[PDB]
């Protein structure tokens, strides 16, 4: 019972507005939102940025990979942990 306890801790801090896990192609499984008109927005916009950034990093010297990424907008901090199985999203304004 460790994954869900970390989800419950991480979704209850001072700025967090949403946690998302999405699979390889899509299918956002285990969102956290009271409606689902903007989960699909994240799920089909963000992993394009994650694998595009893996292209940018890895192109330089192919021993290299990507691990995380952050985009800080004005009102949001979109942190994406991309890896081989999935893409994971946490949204938070500081």
């Amino acid at each position: 019972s460790d994954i869900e306890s970390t989800l419950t801790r991480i979704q209850g801090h001072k700025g967090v507005i949403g946690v998302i896990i999405v699979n390889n192609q899509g299918v956002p499984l285990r969102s956290t939102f009271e409606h689902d008109a903007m989960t699909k927005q994240y799920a089909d916009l963000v992993p394009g940025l994650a694998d595009l950034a893996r292209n940018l990093v890895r192109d330089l010297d192919p021993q290299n990979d990507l691990e995380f990424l952050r985009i800080r907008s004005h009102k949001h901090e979109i942190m994406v942990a991309a890896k081989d199985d999935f893409v994971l999203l946490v949204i938070q304004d500081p």
Partner: peptide, 9 residues
Amino acid sequence: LKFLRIRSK
């Protein structure tokens, strides 16, 4: 956005 941060190892 005013910010961007990509990571390597």
